[model samples]
Target: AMDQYKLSGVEVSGNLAGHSAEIEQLTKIEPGELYNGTKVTKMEDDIKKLLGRYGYAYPRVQSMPEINDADKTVKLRVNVDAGNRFYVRKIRFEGNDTSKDAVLRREMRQMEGAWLGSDLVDQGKERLNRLGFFETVDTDTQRVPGSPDQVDVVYKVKER
Candidate 1:
């Protein structure tokens, strides 16, 4: 039989502390509930998604368990290292000799000077593929020189 422990509480610390309520709600972990180790792992991943949701893409989250054998309860301490929120400094397209920059730029969901989201960045690549002009479309994000919270989005395409 598998051993199960009751959850005493979940405590969150870091830059995202302000959103603890939302995070707690997302985790669905409650006091006096049985602890599921994998569920705690999923909570860490969900924290990452929530970080990205608010444009804080380069954040970190970790969970540490404080076990109470006498009481048979576990407390989870979540530590967050939310790095700087990044912005898109520029969006550049390459390998489009016949196609005007507008042809590709128009397909981008990720806007210049907007908060960076790999979600939006990835959507742009899929959009390019659906345009039928490129046999293959790939994209990369590079940090802007001397800017800790800025990046350049580059799209590489091979035209059909």
Candidate 2:
């Protein structure tokens, strides 16, 4: 399969290798403690930090709740498997029939394909709130139920 790779109209002189990466690995750690190797609980946060180093912020990470047993240990499985990176698909403005989408999007610090982070998204929301342009602004992120590759951003706004 490695040889099946086609480049940008270029010929390969040597063998190309196919690679695989593990975003998060599970382990058994003490109760009330973080994950086995790091001081993190949710893989979503871990992945967020991973992307943060590259200036990728404002990632909307959705996850299935951890199924911990009475023993205080549960298999840490990332329901939203982190495969393809998420980006800003669309920035919508509603309720304020007068507000411009450009003005609202500018207030947001995060943009499309910028990776998903809760804090960054919150920051953008906060910025919008400071504008005093709307009475209500709601932001939510969603992924295709069975697919982790694409996400839809839902924002509801009410006129001030």
Candidate number with greatest lDDT: 1
> In model 2, where is the ten-residue run with the lowest total lDDT?
10-19
lDDT string for model 2 (1-160, tens) is 1122211111111111111132323222343443232233454576555544333433334432243444444344333322455555555556647777777878776666665555666677889888898787887776646655545555567766
The TM-score values for the models, in the order shown, are: 0.74, 0.46
- Give the worst 10-residue stretch by lDDT in candidate 1: 23-32
Write down the lDDT of every candidate, Cα atoms only: 0.81, 0.50
lDDT of 2: 0.50
- Positional deviation of residue 157's Cα in model 2 after best superposition, in angstroms: 1.2
lDDT of 2 at 115: 57
Regions of model 1 farther than 4 Å from truth: 1-3, 30-38, 94-98, 133-139, 156-160
